[PDB]
Every structure is written in C-alpha cells, then in structure tokens.
Design a binder for this molecule. Structure first.
Ligand SMILES: Nc1ncnc2c1ncn2[C@@H]1O[C@H](COP(=O)(O)OP(=O)(O)O)[C@@H](O)[C@H]1O
Ligand SMILES: Nc1ncnc2c1ncn2[C@@H]1O[C@H](COP(=O)(O)OP(=O)(O)O)[C@@H](O)[C@H]1O
Ligand SMILES: Nc1ncnc2c1ncn2[C@@H]1O[C@H](COP(=O)(O)OP(=O)(O)O)[C@@H](O)[C@H]1O
Ligand SMILES: [Mg+2]
Ligand SMILES: [Mg+2]
Ligand SMILES: [Mg+2]
Lengths: 515, 515, 515
C-alpha cells in the first residue's frame, strides 16, 4: 500500500470519520460538564516518628470520634430523578439546598440486604415538610421534634425552595467510617520531618474543611491525654473531573476507532472498483456507465444526462465491435439481478433509434420482465403467448411512445420459462425479425440464477455482460463468462454500470458535464 | 529517491518554504518581544535540620502574615485593551503608572462564580479620579477617604498621566496566598548546611524584593518567639521569556513544518511531469509546448513567442508523420477540457498557413466551440446549420483575417450534437474539402466527457491527443487512447502542452530564446 | 564508489579545498592571537565543615565588603575603537595605560535602560586631562578634586601617554558583585579536609591577586568576629584562550567543511564527463576536442594547436563515415547554444581545405550567425537575400582569406527564419553547389531551441551533433537525437567539444603535444 491510497480512503469515508469523532467528543464533553465536581481540603500538622501517627490518624477510634461529633451518619442527598439532573441543575445556576438535621432515628428495618434505612422528605414551605418512608405520609414542622410511627426526626433551618425532595439515610457507623477513610489521606511530605500533610476530598467544599478540622482537633486532643501549623482550607478549584484531559482522550479515542473502522471496511471490500480489475482477467470493458441521480426511459426524459452520454459512447463502440458478426442480434445479460441489464438494454435501444436505425427490443425475461410497464403496454400477447403457440408474430410487436423503436413484451408469466425458450419458434421469430430490422436487442435474466440466457445466446451474434459497480466481484463475472463458454456462447465483453466518484480510485472516467 | 530530486523539490518550493519559515519566525519574535518580562529576587538564610523549615516557610501562617503586612490582597493592574498593549507600551518607552492604595473594601458581591470584586479607576489629574464598578460613576480625591455606595477606598500618591485606567481587584486571602506560593521557592543548596536559598519571581522588580524581605523578617521573628545572611535583591536581567531559545525554536519549527508540507505535496502529485512518463507507456510525444506568458491568435500577434517555436517543431514533425496517411485530415482531441486543444489546433493552422499551404480549420466542437470569436465571425451558418440541412457547403466557410487560412465555425448550438455528426453529410463535406485544400484540421471536444471525437475520428487520417502538463495523469491519457482504439480510431500520438520550468525535473526542453 | 574516484575528486578540487582550509585556519589564528588573555590567581585556606563556608564566601556580604574596600564599582577601560585594537596594541608591545581613581560620582542619569553612567577621559599630559560625558567638555588636574556639573571626580597618578582615551563607568554595586562572583570559584580539593582552594580569573594579573587577598582577609576577619595557608598568587601563563586546541579545531573544521562541499558538488554534477556516457546510450562519438587556451580561425592562426590536431582526427574519421552517403552535404548542429557548432564547423572546413579539396561553408544560422565577421565580409547578399528572392546564387559566395574555401554568410536577419528555409530555392542552391564542390558544410542553430536544423537536415547526407563537455547532459543529447529522428533526419553521431583535464576522469584522451 501507499499513502495516496490511504488518503483517498480517508477522503471517501470522511462522513463516517467525522460523525464518529463528533459523537465521541460530544460524550466526553457531556461527561466533563455533568460530572459532579470534587474539591480538596488540606491541613499541616507538626510532630515533635510520624510513622505510627499515620496509622493512628486512619484508625477507627479517631475517625469514629469525628463522625460522632459531626453526625456524619446522617446522609442527606438532594433528589434528582435522572443521572444528569444534578449536573444540569448546577449548570443552570440553581443553588443546591441543604437541611440541618441534629437527630435521626429510623425504625431500623435491618433486613437481609438493606442495612441502611432511608426516607424521603418533601419541602412544603420554610416551616413544615412531608415525610414518607414506604408510603406512610407524615407532616412535620421545623423546631418541634417528631416521634411518630417508630420514627424520630429533628429538622432545623430548612434552606431550599418548596417542592424539593431530599433522601435522608441513616447509614451504619462502620459505613460512615469507611466512607470517611476512603477520601482521607495522610502523608509525610519530607519522609523525615515532623510535618504531616492531611488531605480530604468531597463534593461539599465547606463540609470537608469542617471534617478535617474535626479530625485534627480530635487527634491533637487525644495525643495530649503535636502542633497544628495549618488548619484545613479548601482549594476552590475542583480536582475532579479533569476536563481537558478527558476531552483530549475522547477526541483521540474517536479518531482511533474511526481509523480502525475504515481500515476494517477497506480490508473487507471485494467488489469491482475499476475496469482494470476486469481487464487484468482478460475481459474487454466497452463502457462505464455512471449512476444517473435524475417508469420512464432516461434516454428520452433527460437525453443530456451523463449516463446517456456514456451510453452513446457504448453505441459507438458497438457499431465497430458488431462488424463481422454472424447476425444483427445483440444479447445483454449479467451475473446477478439488479445489475442494470434492463436499464442498459432499453436506453441503448433508445440511443440507437435516434440515429435513424430500425430497432427491435425483445424482453426475453419470462420470469420478471417489466419492460411493458416501462414502455406503455397492451400486456396481452407477449413472447409467452407466441412461444406457447397461441399468438402470431404480428400481434406481439408494439411501439415505444417516446422512443422510436419496436418492442416485444414478455407476456403472461409461464410455468416453464426455460422450456418455452427452447422451441424452434424462437429461432423462427429471430430469423424473421432479422430481415425487417437493422438491430435486435434481447434482454435476459441473469446467468448465475437461471439458464435462460444460455439458451437465448445460441442465436445471438453478439453477447455482452453487465457488471454492477460495487456489488459484483471479479470472480462472479469470470464464473458467468465460463458458464456461458461451456454452453457454446462466446461473450464479447462487459459493461460496468452504476459507477460513482471515489477519491481512492485514481481512475478517471469522463463522468462530468461538458457544455 | 536521490538527493538531486529532493534538492530540486526544495528549489521549486522555495517560495512556500521561505514564506512559512518567515511567518513562524515573525510570530516567535513577536512573542519574545511582547511577553511581559519576569524578574527574580533571592535571599540567603542561615539555620543553626532545614527540612521542616522548608515546610514552615511555605505554610499559610507565615505567607498570610506577609500578605497582611504588605496588603497583597489589593491587586492593581494598569489597563490596556489588547493582549499586546502592555508590550507595545513598554517598547515605546512609556513609564508604567502605579497607585498606592492603603484601604480597599468592595461591596463583596460574592455570587456563584465571581468571588473577586473589581472596579475601574480612571485618572483625571494628579489629585482627583473617577471610579466605576458597574456603571456607577463616583468622584474621589487623593487624601480624603471615600465611603460611598457600600464602597470604601483610600488612594495615595497617584503617579501616572491623566486618562489612564486601572483595574482594582479585591481578591480573597487564600487566592493571594496561593499566588504568592506559586512564585516562591525554597532550597537548601548544600543539602546538609544551615544555608537556605529563598527565591521569588514577578514582573515588578521592587515589589518582589520587598515581599521576600517581608517573608524573611516574618520567619526570623516567628522563630525567635536563624540568621539572614543575604537580604533580598533582584537580578536586573529578567529570567523569562528566554528570547534566543524562543527564536531558535520558532525557526526550527518553521523549517520542519515547511519540509513536511513539501514532502506531502511531492508524495501527492500524480500529473504528468515529462514526456518520458508518456513514452514509458508506449505513447509517442511529438512536441512539448511551453506556457506563453504573453481573443487573438498567438502565432499572429507574437510570431517569435517560444510556444510558436515549439509549434513550428510540431509542424515539421507532422509533415513527416502524415506521410502515408489515408487522407489529409488531422483531428486534434484530448482527455479533459481546457488541456489546450483549441490553442494547439488554431496556432498549428496558422503556422502551416504561413508556409504557403491552403488550410481549412473546422470547429467541430458543437457544444462549446468559440473559434468564431477568436477569428472574427459572421456567426450565422456554421457546421450545425450545414449538418441539419439548412445551409450549403459554400456559405459556411470564412477567412481568418490575420491568419491566412479558411475556417468553419460551429454555428448555433444544437440539441443533438453527437447525432448531427453521424449524418453522411459530414463525410460529404470532408470529401469535398479534401480536394480543395492541402490540409484540414478538426478541433473536437474531449473524449472522456463525450463521444463526438470518436465519431469524427473515423474520417481523419491522423489523430493526435493533447495532454495538459500538470493537470492530466498518465492513466487519463492511456484511458483516452483505449477509448479511441475501441471505436476503431488509431491515435498517432500525443502533444504535451503548457510545460513550465521545474528544478526537480532534470528534463531539458528547448524553452528559451535564441536570437 | 571506489577510492580512486574520491582521490581524483580531491585532486581536482584541491584549489577550493586548500583555499577553504587556509581561510578557516587564518581566522582561528587571528582569534587565538587577538583574544585578550585571561589569567588565574589562587589561594589556599585552612578550616579547623567547609560546606557552609563555601556558601559564606560567595555571599553578597563578603563580596560586597571586598568591592567597597577595593572600589571595584569604578570600571576603567582603555579605549580602542575596533574590536581588534586591543589585541594589535598588545602584539605591538605597547604598554597598557592605567589610572588610579579614588572618588567617582556621576550624575546618575538612571533612565529606563542605561543604569550605568559612563564618561570619557582623554589624557592631555601627565597632569591635566579632558572629560566628556555627553559632549560637555571639562578640564581637570591630577591632585585637585573636581566637583562640577553634577560630576565629582578625583584622579591620581595618570600613567599613560598623551592622547589616550579611557571609558570610566560607575556601575551599580550589585553589578560589581555579580561580576566578581562570575569569575570566583571555591572548592574543597579533598572533599573532607579543612583545605579550601579559592580561584579567581581576570585580565589584570595584579588586580586579581589583590582582589583575592582582600576576599581572604575579609572572610578571615569576619569569622574571628580559619587560617590562610597560601595567599593569592597569579599563574603568569594565561589560562585562556587555549591557542593550540583552537588552531587544531580550526584546521579540522576547515577540512570537514571542504570535504562536505566537494562531496556536494560531486553529487550534484550531471554534465557529460567522458565519451563513454554517450556510447552507453548508443551514440557514436567521432572525436573529442579539447579547449584551445590560445575573430580568427584557429586552424589558420595556430595550425599546431591541440584542438586542430583533434579536428584532423575528426577529418579522417569523417572521410570514412561519409562514404556511401547520399550526397556530399554535412550538417553540424547541437542541443544548446555555445556548445561549439560554429567553432567545429569552420575549423573543420579549414582543415579539409588544406588537403586540396574544394569546400563550401554555408552559415544557415539566420538568427545569430556571425561567420561573416570571422571570415572577413561584404555583409550584403547573404543567404537571406537569396532565399527571399532578391539575390542570385553567384553574388552570395565569397572567399575566406586565410582559409582556402568558399562561404555563404547569413545575410540580413529576416523576420521569418524557419519559413525562409522551407523554400524550394534552398534545395536548388544545395543541388547546384553539390556539383561545383567536393564538400558542403552547413552550420545551424541548436535543435532544442528552434526547428531550423530539422528543416535543413532533410537535404544533408550526413548530420553530426556537437555536445559541450561539461554543460550538456546525456538526456539533452538523447532528446536532441530523438527530435531529429521524429522529423525524418538520421543523426550519424556526436562530437564532444571543450574537454579539459580532470584527475577523477580515468579516461585518457590524446590531448598533449607530440613533437
Ligand atoms: N446507472 C444507473 N443509474 C440510475 N439507475 C440505474 C442505473 N442502472 C440501473 N438503474 C436502475 O436501478 C434499478 C435496477 O436495475 P435493472 O436494470 O432493472 O436490473 P436487472 O439487472 O435485474 O435487469 C432499476 O430501477 C434501474 O432503472
Ligand atoms: N501553452 C499555452 N500557453 C498559453 N495559453 C494557453 C496554452 N494552452 C492553452 N492556453 C490557453 O488556456 C485556455 C484554455 O485552453 P483551450 O485550448 O481553449 O482548451 P480546450 O482543450 O478545452 O479546447 C485558453 O484560453 C488557451 O488560449
Ligand atoms: N574547444 C574550444 N576551444 C576554444 N574555444 C572554443 C571551443 N569551442 C568553442 N569555442 C569558442 O567558444 C565560443 C562559443 O562557441 P560557438 O561555436 O560560437 O557556439 P555555437 O554552438 O552557439 O555555434 C566561441 O567564441 C568559440 O570560438
Ligand atoms: Mg431486468
Ligand atoms: Mg476547445
Ligand atoms: Mg553558432
């Protein structure tokens, strides 16, 4: 491989690359803007050692004392239903509410799993509130204590707007101690001095400084039954989430996944990409037809279409190839369905009719031929009725209205399509038509699916295959050619159909307007 | 690859290389001259240890004491609207102003984000000044204190020119302490001695020395409730920005980006560069025409042009190639539009007419032919009107004025250009003209876009393709030749057009004046 | 590559190699002889530790005390206008002057940048002197103090010759301390003993020893409020610049730059170097003509020239090649101008005329032919006038005086040179001349520039190309041959012209005298 190939591949897949990278970067931005910020407070302690003091600070006696002093076993969480409600509320500038609770005693359900009882408190005004544990609604008032239904609560100084809801949990003392220990750090910072740096993290910048001051006071008071050089203050800039590294990670991750996905698609492609793939195998390509982005004949509705220009190129190529052919019959076939055989056949018939030659178009697709719909029809008396013997050769020929050539439709779909085509009446029809017309074009079903084209091809002096631009593979076309050669039918060459513009190709068609 | 190639590439791209390097170096110089200089002061302290003293110096008690003593919570910034105003003002030799403020109390808005209140003070004279916080204009006088609108201010010794504006911020004490700590360093410098080196950086060389003296005095006074060997002095040479390394980095960065960009363009080029690329594929090149930097025929306006000399070379080559041709008709075509087919065709007709031969020029580009504009025209009765049957072969031929040959214009643009050219009247016209002229030159549309040239080429004894020097690729020309061969038209060879001088080429044309 | 090639390349480029190396070595010698010498003094101190004493010696208290004692803030510099004046003065044996100044007070301008005031003192005699700060001229006398114009000066013991000028600077105390600190070093030299080695460098060998003695005394005196084992003495041999390493570096740098430059030129050469380069491509070389270092014909002025000998070799080669040629016409052409086509053509005509054969020389360079100047002329009625029809074939032929052959000049420069040559009168002239002469030689313009030679070559039975020895490339000659072949002109072979002696060649011509 070379760099031009990969650059063209990136240019072609730019829509997917951009979409994937933008999606990943949007998710990264949403996380870096909706994650709750985490602040850090710290304090500095003087030791007159300092290895066992580190274990004494993190022990459950000191931390438990702090928790008892500060009532850290009463967890209060402002309620937002979604997982992004809190982040949005912070972004909108809404001030978070808080409640001071000095006494809480839940009935302590203490079942197998839920060791932490919790209730929901809804604020009705600055004074009263509603409480529900499991649907049991009670009304309480700030100030006066509540002792009802096995529930004790004392609420002071509700500072929020009415309608807010708060989850109040009474978690066990060990759970509180473990929570405090997880966010608490002690370090020496000199490895030999009596200086210890205590650190604490949390989402409330005032609460963490109060908690660290409590820890320092408890440790100092316990030791004298040590000097606090720096009492706890909180850095106002949150330490998490780290926004810029998150966004950079998101962008780079999006780019790498996009690149590997494009590499995956490029390594898994097998369709035809240029006429050179067919010409390596030894197959003549007579034209490349682009997709016309424009029940009508294209060569009649839009004669100045680019696909019709490419078909005029095919017309001039054929006028030279079909010299020294045994008769004036051309058969168009292909490997797979919807490659474009009917499109090519009918539009070629129209462009050859505009030059003043008499053209007969035969729809010999007895299984799915729709040419009568595309030309305007009297669907009676098609090729079926003629072959089965219930029609004559003069009742089946009709005129294309905006075209200028004659045609024969398929007729009624028969039960034995391949066997009807083997009747000698088919060759009688071809020999009769070959004397009243300058050209006969026969449209057929694909050869890999059924065998009708190989029957028809015995009486055609020229045979061309239609290959679809991206769908078909080189192996398919080669197998189709060999299946034709085995039945005694020589295939003159190929027509590539439905070509589109690709930056990776480096093959230049003339698929652009000139005028 | 070899070194001659890369040297030629650099010579060719020197304009881009020089421009990019000069832009990057100019940006580096602008930064190294507009960045505010940062000075450094330092002091030396004697310790009679020295590991915990390092943590005691950087603690908030000592630094906070210094900040309280020196009023470092009053931030004063001289106001320049742009981000380069201060640098320009320093470069112009303008002396920065300063104000001594001993008492500041802003109303402490203290909203969600802006924790630092700030006002703007405009100097009206040496005595009075104007103050605005949020549009509230007040007048104050140096000396007498101001207590108005919840704002307290005391300003002493305004030393600036009238019209200056200063931002006065009252930042919080922790913010001041963090600012001081960021620019403050303590080191041991012997790792065992009682010597400590204290360092401080900042943009004011006197303020930083005062701050470091205050820190040293506070630490010394606190310890005795230590010897200061060296009091703080400031190195007069700024430590940042480091100009020479910045400029060197800018130059080297410019060179590397230029080299990679030129390498990128060289690896992405696919156009034809020399006739050897076409001759490898097996295509005869009959001439290489340079760009003529000079609605007129070039071979008539400037007969001594270099392009006309190259076209005389083509004339002598053709006089030998067109021997043993079936008729005296030459068709010029090409792959893509604006390769130079009309330019070559018409100028070749002029140079062959000056040698005394009778020449007919036919503009068979029925879609975009403009030869009638370039020759001086009676636009009626062109090739269209003749082919469609509404004109005779004697009414369509006209004389080029400054030329010396006959011509046929396209006529009115028809709706069916390819089908008009297929009329037997075209061959009748060619056979009639072939007996009254020594040479007929036919100009055509490009073959990749439309098929008209392949129709015309059946009656031309000689056919040449025009390839544009840098635009076309070898694949394009090969595809054009094969599309012609498929239609039964043998292409004699190619003409390379619009060649220019490239140091990387190492192919020598004769594109220079001799006279 | 092999060693013989590179040795020959060095032999050929020896002039450049020697010049570059000599230039670099001369610059190195000039630096190593003009750089001011820097002396070193040192002293040895005993410590009864020694880690903090190192920081105490380099502190600003001790160094500042030394500077105050020795008045090191008075900088005196003897004035030389150029940057090599001092070095030359030292080399000429001139004794540097000195002035003892005990009191200096400049007005202390103290602007934004120039913190160091300076004045210029011009010595008028042993007693009086002139002083100028900014053009303000004052007269002072040794002894009596000066207090004028805000300037205080006391000068003692002027020891210099009259006319000398000295810059006297009053630099700030910190600048003096930093200057002293930069040149001062302290080391332990045992890493554990009480021995310290103090070192000081400077351009004055007595001043530095005095300064180091002052530093030692101040440190010793301060400590007792330490033993000086060795007081300061100066090594009389300067420590910088180190001459031999500088000169060796200069020589080696010159050699490496010379070698890379010669390698650069050798890798960038593309011209023809030997006839073998042309014979690989399949081109017969019939002669190699050397440069003749000798408006005259060389074969007449200096018949025993080496170039004329090589041309006699060409004459004998041609007498055998031109057998079985269709006529007796020889055309000489070439690729590029000033390859030597006229030189070869005319001198070949002279050497063939001395053998008793009748020779006609035709100057068919209608664009820049100067043969009439070189033969002695009647410039009227040349080839132009004949072709345009205004002269006959008998009025245009003239005699070369010192030669022995006939010639036709170009005539008046025409506006249509290529079209004049296409007249059938040219072939009439050639057919008439072919019956009255044994040989006709035609000189032409180069074929890459214009096409005239390809027109003339149709009527020449033999055609030779001239290639210039170093200017032309193999690609040029091959392109010229192919441009001739395309026009139906067969080129017999080549003549290499202007060959010179190259040690790298290893191709031996016979370009030496034999006689
Ligand atoms: N180059 C093309 N541009 C636009 N439409 C095309 C092109 N080729 C085929 N088609 C359309 O795509 C559809 C499938 O092609 P069709 O010719 O009917 O398939 P089949 O090979 O089975 O006979 C048709 O509706 C056809 O009109
Ligand atoms: N070697 C050239 N030097 C200067 N101008 C040129 C050269 N070749 C083409 N042109 C000019 O560039 C324009 C486009 O070329 P043209 O011959 O008209 O294109 P086309 O190939 O479509 O017929 C024209 O205006 C032409 O005169
Ligand atoms: N081998 C040579 N030795 C000395 N002078 C030479 C040699 N070859 C050419 N010259 C001189 O160098 C100049 C340029 O060569 P000239 O023959 O006039 O060039 P051109 O190829 O254009 O006809 C002339 O003055 C010529 O006399
Ligand atoms: Mg179909
Ligand atoms: Mg054109
Ligand atoms: Mg000459």
């Amino acid at each position: 491989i070379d760099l031009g190939r990969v650059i063209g591949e990136l240019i072609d897949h730019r829509k997917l690359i951009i979409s994937i990278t933008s999606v990943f970067t949007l998710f990264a931005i949403l996380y870096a803007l909706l994650a709750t910020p985490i602040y850090e407070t710290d304090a500095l302690i003087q030791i007159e050692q300092s290895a066992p003091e580190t274990a004494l600070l993190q022990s459950r006696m000191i931390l438990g004392k702090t928790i008892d002093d500060l009532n850290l076993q009463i967890q209060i969480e402002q309620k937002y239903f979604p997982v992004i409600g809190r982040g949005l509320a912070r972004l909108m500038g809404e001030k978070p509410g808080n409640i001071d609770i000095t006494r809480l005693y839940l009935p302590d359900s203490d079942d197998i799993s839920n060791n932490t009882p919790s209730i929901i408190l809804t604020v009705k005004d600055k004074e009263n509130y509603s409480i529900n544990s499991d649907g049991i609604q009670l009304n309480g008032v700030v100030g006066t204590l509540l002792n009802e239904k096995g529930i004790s609560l004392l609420v002071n100084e509700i500072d929020a707007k009415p309608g807010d809801q708060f989850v109040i949990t009474q978690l066990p003392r060990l759970k509180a101690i473990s929570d405090l220990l997880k966010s608490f750090s002690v370090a020496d910072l000199g490895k030999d001095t009596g200086m210890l740096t205590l650190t604490l993290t949390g989402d409330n910048p005032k609460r963490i400084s109060h908690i660290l001051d409590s820890i320092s006071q408890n440790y100092l008071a316990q030791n004298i039954a040590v000097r606090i050089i720096d009492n706890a203050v909180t850095d106002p800039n949150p330490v998490r989430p780290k926004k810029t590294i998150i966004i950079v990670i998101g962008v780079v991750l999006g780019l790498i996944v996009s690149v590997v996905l494009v590499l995956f698609q490029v390594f898994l492609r097998r369709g035809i990409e240029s006429p050179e793939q067919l010409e390596e195998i030894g197959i003549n390509v007579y034209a490349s037809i682009p997709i016309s982005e424009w029940d009508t004949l294209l060569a009649v509705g839009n004669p100045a279409d680019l696909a019709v220009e490419a078909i005029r190129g095919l017309r001039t190529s054929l006028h030279f190839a079909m010299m020294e052919a045994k008769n004036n019959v051309l058969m168009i076939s292909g490997a797979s369905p919807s490659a474009g055989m009917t499109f090519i056949s009918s539009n070629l018939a129209a462009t050859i009719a505009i030059t003043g030659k008499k053209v007969l178009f035969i729809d010999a697709d007895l299984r799915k031929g729709y040419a009568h719909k595309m030309f305007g029809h009297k669907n009676d008396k098609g090729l079926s009725e003629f072959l089965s013997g219930q029609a004559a050769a003069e009742m089946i020929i009709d005129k294309v209205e905006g075209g200028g050539f004659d045609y024969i439709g398929r007729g009624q779909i028969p039960p034995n399509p391949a066997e009807l085509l083997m009747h000698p009446r088919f060759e009688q029809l071809l020999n009769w038509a070959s004397q009243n017309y300058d050209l006969i074009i026969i449209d057929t079903p694909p050869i890999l699916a059924v065998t009708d084209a190989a029957i028809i091809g015995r009486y055609a002096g020229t045979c061309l295959l239609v290959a679809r631009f991206e769908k078909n593979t080189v192996k398919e076309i080669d197998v189709s050619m060999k299946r034709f050669e085995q039945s005694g039918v020589v295939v003159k060459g190929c027509i590539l159909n439905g070509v589109v513009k690709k930056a990776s190709s480096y093959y230049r068609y003339g698929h652009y307007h000139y005028g």
